[PDB]
Ligand binder design. Structure first.
Ligand SMILES: *[C@@H]1O[C@H](CO)[C@@H](O[C@@H]2O[C@H](CO)[C@@H](O)[C@H](O)[C@H]2NC(C)=O)[C@H](O)[C@H]1NC(C)=O
Ligand SMILES: COc1ccc(CC(=O)NC(=N)NCc2ccc(C)cc2)cc1OC
Ligand SMILES: *[C@@H]1O[C@H](CO)[C@@H](O)[C@H](O)[C@H]1NC(C)=O
Lengths: 237, 103, 240, 97
């Protein structure tokens, strides 16, 4: 029960400077964004799979487990949606720019009162990002609001005893409200509690951008529609 | 019932709620590699067997060997990718990509 | 046990970075000379000495290199544990009473390469896990043992090549202290992957203190170390 | 002679247990022959100091042999830095609590 993408151009990496890839458990990356952000303008795997008419529906969906114990850890469904991993109906958001899976973010309301992204922002649905990313100043406001303290690389830590007490963070997308409970946007470490919110400034013309990483996708079953150029979300199961 | 193929499920492995990777195949017969299906990038890359000794990551990761594939097509063109976290360089090649590995 | 009365210590209120988050220990108990003491505070052992709490003013270290052996090491205050060493102690006179500083005659690589040929100054440091030497000298060493640089003066060796590696002898007090490749290489495992870290690190210690070589836990691991304060010398034996 | 059992972490960290005060308060320390100062985390450490959150803290109010100094200290190790203030008390080896 699998697919074979013929005549696919890929890169054979010979230089991987740093420690980034030493640490990494995977061997490489299979990019799934639009052909615009493809290095040396190479036709990506899904775009080739589309061209070769290897699926009926040109869509792909991600279920990501938020417990490293669970089996399977996730699922990528090529050419459809797995109904056994989501609740209720999909709610679609139109892609604003066909490079990343870019959608308009209406607001980021912190249950406590604070509202970030008040005039509206642009966000990207990124599976290769584990945390939520936002502008340095906006994310700095957020962590002052949830009693978190900075460590390094725009990362913040919360005392674990305070995680219960924390406010929810709702993301207003396509008119609907996508709530993240403190247990959703915080990760236990080594025992330290890492905030699922990271401060990083993406420079223009691409930026500023918010990144809805695995923290988000883990809570909301994500659908990537290429025929209709939209992103659908449903309460993960 | 006798039904039509339908969608392809690619089982993903979760590492510490930080890494979500699945298995793929490159070549004929398929050579297995684990990849991150990154919706934030648009390029496919795996470590080459022709990797420079300085690249330590290469030592502990699966390497593509073009000589073992019959569907391999040489292009040779150099590349460079920059992600928010890291970077890499190498050269382009063309081959069959299987999902899942199917070896 | 022993009780060191009227000891001045520091109560840390700021620990910037990640260094101490990561660390499994709560603090540091320094055991070098009072010269390198911040705000010239009399150190624990110097106080323990003054209070005549031990018969002999010496301290020993056995460090297990299993690593998971029980116990994983021993500090013997006021003596030497004979159950953790082989043969007799060979003493080296301390050259400068700040660190536990001894003269290093040479750094020999079995395959051919000699480093510190005219002689250097080394420090016996328990708070250093690896061996440290000057950046250029250590760079020569790893070219010689087929290791490649990782980051922050740290080098990595392909594990398949560890068998094939040459020994490294340290000439101290006339005697020769060999380190087999298994002694000077660390099998670092993480996320189900194994790498071999070279026990040799390149770092330049600036003057007046430097240049200095550092014989860390890699050395002390293979050689039971004795720190004599009455006679101002450092003794070594083969660890058991 | 007194034997101080040491714990080995990944052939990189060798630390043993000690006591500060009357009755002794337990802390794990690195017996570093490359340094000459004794320091442990204080209960009066800054909320910004995350390392403090997951490490044992000295409380001078719980010790009867505590003698106040107050003098500020600043240590700079290759790897990292720390600052705090000086205090005097009884140091037990091993903890003996
Ligand atoms: C390198 O591989 C690339 C990718 O296939 C080749 O260039 C592309 O060719 C396709 C048609 O097959 C075009 O649609 C792309 O737009 C081209 N890429 C770029 C950079 O725009 C290229 O010819 C191969 N090189 C060699 C020397 O074989
Ligand atoms: C295992 O964790 C630690 C152990 C000890 C310390 C203190 C320290 O820096 N000790 C040390 N021995 N430094 C080496 C040196 C370098 C130059 C000269 C001149 C002297 C000595 C800090 C640690 O946290 C990372
Ligand atoms: C603090 O301790 C030092 C070292 O023992 C001593 O010289 C100094 O006088 C003390 N300071 C005070 C204010 O007690």
């Amino acid at each position: 029960g699998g697919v074979k993408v013929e005549r696919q151009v890929f890169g054979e990496a010979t230089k991987q400077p740093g420690i980034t890839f030493i640490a990494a458990k995977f061997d490489g990356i299979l990019g799934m964004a639009y052909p615009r952000i493809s290095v040396n303008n190479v036709l990506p795997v899904f775009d080739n799979l589309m061209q070769q008419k290897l699926v009926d529906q040109n869509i792909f969906s991600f279920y990501l487990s938020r417990d490293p114990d669970a089996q399977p850890g996730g699922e990528l469904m090529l050419g459809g949606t797995d109904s056994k991993y989501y609740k209720g109906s999909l709610s679609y958001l139109n892609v604003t720019r066909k490079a990343y899976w870019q959608v308009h973010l209406d607001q980021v309301e912190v249950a406590s009162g604070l509202t970030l992204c008040k005039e509206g922002c642009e966000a990207i649905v990124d599976t290769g990002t584990s945390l939520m990313v936002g502008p340095v100043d906006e994310v700095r406001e957020l962590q002052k609001a949830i009693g978190a303290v900075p460590l390094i690389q725009g990362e913040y830590m919360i005392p674990c005893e305070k995680v219960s007490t924390l406010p929810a963070i709702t993301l207003k997308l396509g008119g609907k409200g996508y709530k993240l409970s403190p247990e959703d946007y915080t990760l236990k470490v080594s025992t330290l509690c890492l905030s699922g919110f990271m401060g990083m400034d993406i420079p223009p013309p691409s930026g500023p951008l918010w990144i809805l990483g695995d923290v988000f996708i883990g809570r909301y079953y994500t659908v990537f529609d290429r025929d209709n150029n939209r992103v659908g979300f449903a309460e993960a199961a | 019932p006798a039904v039509t193929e339908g969608p392809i499920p690619e089982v993903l492995k979760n590492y510490m709620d930080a890494q979500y990777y699945g298995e793929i195949g490159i070549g004929t017969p398929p050579q297995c590699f684990t990849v991150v299906f990154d919706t934030g990038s648009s390029n496919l890359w795996v470590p080459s067997i022709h990797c420079k000794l300085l690249d330590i990551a290469c030592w502990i990761h699966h390497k593509y060997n073009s000589d073992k594939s019959s569907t391999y097509v040489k292009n040779g063109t150099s590349f460079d990718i920059h992600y928010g976290s890291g970077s890499l360089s190498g050269y382009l090649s063309q081959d069959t990509v299987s999902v899942p590995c199917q070896s």
